[PDB]
């Protein structure tokens, strides 16, 4: 989040978190974070949840331009820059960024792209920028209707408006499925209470029964069983396994 | 992999126009772009100027607009800087470097540098 | 457009001693600084591109840190090919600016 370099919407950079003890807290305390919209998922739960897996996005857009970034949503962005899933879980997060990307007639190096020779797929990405095919006329060279260049800037000039100036974006991509899981938050663990009826959350798996030593062998690979209707007949502990 | 090739030294007489080119060698030229700085004798760098060929749009630093033009073309894959109304100050060895702010949101600090091309203005 | 001024101007000290440089700016810029080792009259070899971050193949005897309207460039010790100016590189704007260049020479 707090890293000086932050990518174009298109060849979006893209990393990976894993192993590790998440803390939402540092992320919507922060002031410039004005923006904070979660899908599938909610601000104030974030630190109670714990992730199977977890993929953070990061872009750099105009602030109006904001509005693209949402599932199934439709535009130049959304269409040939960056699209979310349908489904998509997780949340999206901006902030101004002006003090930083804002120059006089500049900031070139935050781009993206008004049309494409087909939408892109969801978390697809395109590190070319070839030229749209005219097909009316041969085009190998520059050319007139369709062989204009896809990239193109705001120039991102300090007199522009929330409409136009330049907002910092990070969409944070989530898998919700229970374990096996590496990132969530600092919920602390409690001894494990058997043959009494007793509230439990397992990794995230908040019930209430009775844990017993189970005797069904299960594999090594193996970290959680089903009874009929996705009913979770069995867990293995985080901790001892 | 990319690189860069730069013109031969030009000389001329004060209160003309000197040419200054360098090719574009690796991709090809719609993936590439130029800016040219200057290093004089006893001092510093200088930057003159930027082109994105493909865009059309270019831009020069305060101390060089009207006296500085840019152009290039993919037929020869190759710059074309030219200086105005050269002073014997302007006596100084020019460079040409690959651009970054072209594309996929990385910044405009110059990777890949020519040779460096002299110019001396003299009677 | 915004100056910056490079602070001492020359420096001295032998092969092997921890050297520290520093530059001056009139204006708080938002650490969009970069640093350079040029020998004189030769091409410049870039070395720092974010403040504290080094370019790729850049060895780790260089770093650097500051913040606002200062910086600061160090290097753990004074090596044989370190006879050479160092140019803090403002691009915090369009104007780019270079700084005054500081320069050493090996103590003898």
């Known amino acids: 989040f707090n890293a000086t370099r932050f990518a174009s919407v298109y060849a979006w950079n893209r990393k990976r978190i894993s192993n590790c003890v998440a803390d939402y807290s540092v992320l919507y305390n922060l002031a410039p974070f004005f923006t904070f919209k979660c899908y599938g998922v909610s601000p104030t739960k974030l630190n109670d949840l714990c992730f199977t897996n977890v993929y953070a996005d990061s872009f750099v857009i105009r602030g109006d331009e904001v509005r693209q970034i949402a599932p199934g949503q439709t535009g130049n962005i959304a269409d040939y820059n960056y699209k979310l899933p349908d489904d998509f879980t997780g949340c999206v997060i901006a902030w101004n960024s002006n003090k930083l990307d804002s120059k006089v007639s500049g900031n070139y190096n935050y781009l993206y792209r008004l049309f494409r020779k087909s939408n892109l797929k969801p978390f697809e990405r395109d590190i070319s920028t070839e030229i749209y095919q005219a097909g009316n006329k041969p085009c190998n060279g520059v050319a007139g209707f369709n062989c204009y260049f896809p990239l193109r800037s705001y120039s991102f000039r300090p007199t522009y408006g929330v409409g136009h100036q330049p907002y910092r974006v990070v969409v944070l991509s989530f898998e919700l499925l229970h374990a096996p899981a590496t990132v969530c938050g600092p919920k602390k663990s409690t001894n494990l209470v058997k043959n009494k009826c007793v509230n439990f959350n397992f990794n995230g798996l908040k019930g209430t029964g009775v844990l017993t030593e189970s005797n069904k062998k299960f594999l090594p690979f193996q970290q959680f069983g089903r009874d009929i209707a996705d009913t979770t007949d069995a867990v293995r502990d985080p901790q001892t396994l | 992999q990319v690189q860069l090739v730069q013109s031969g030294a030009e000389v001329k007489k004060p209160g003309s126009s000197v040419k200054v080119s360098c090719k574009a060698s690796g991709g090809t030229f719609s993936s590439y772009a130029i800016s040219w700085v200057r290093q004089a004798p006893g001092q510093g760098l200088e930057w003159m100027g930027r082109?994105?060929?493909?865009?059309?749009?270019?831009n020069y630093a305060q101390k060089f607009q009207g006296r500085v033009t840019i152009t290039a073309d993919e037929s020869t894959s190759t710059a074309y800087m030219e200086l105005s109304s050269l002073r014997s100050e302007d006596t100084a060895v020019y460079y040409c470097?690959?651009?970054?702010?072209?594309?996929?949101?990385?910044?405009?600090?110059?990777?890949?540098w020519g040779q460096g091309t002299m110019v001396t203005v003299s009677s | 457009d915004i100056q910056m001024t490079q602070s001492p101007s020359s420096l001295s000290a032998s092969v092997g001693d921890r050297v520290t440089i520093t530059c001056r700016a009139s204006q708080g810029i938002s650490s969009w600084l970069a640093w350079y080792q040029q020998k004189p009259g030769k091409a410049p070899k870039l070395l720092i591109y974010d403040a504290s971050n080094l370019e790729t193949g850049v060895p780790s005897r260089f770093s650097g840190s500051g913040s606002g309207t200062d910086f600061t460039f160090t290097i753990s010790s004074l090596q044989p090919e370190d006879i050479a100016t160092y140019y803090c590189?403002?691009?915090?704007?369009?104007?780019?600016?270079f700084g005054g260049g500081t320069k050493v020479e090996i103590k003898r």
């Open positions: 082109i994105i060929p493909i865009f059309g749009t270019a």
């Open positions: 470097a690959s651009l970054a702010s072209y594309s996929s949101g990385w910044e405009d600090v110059f990777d890949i």
């Open positions: 590189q403002q691009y915090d704007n369009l104007p780019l600016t």
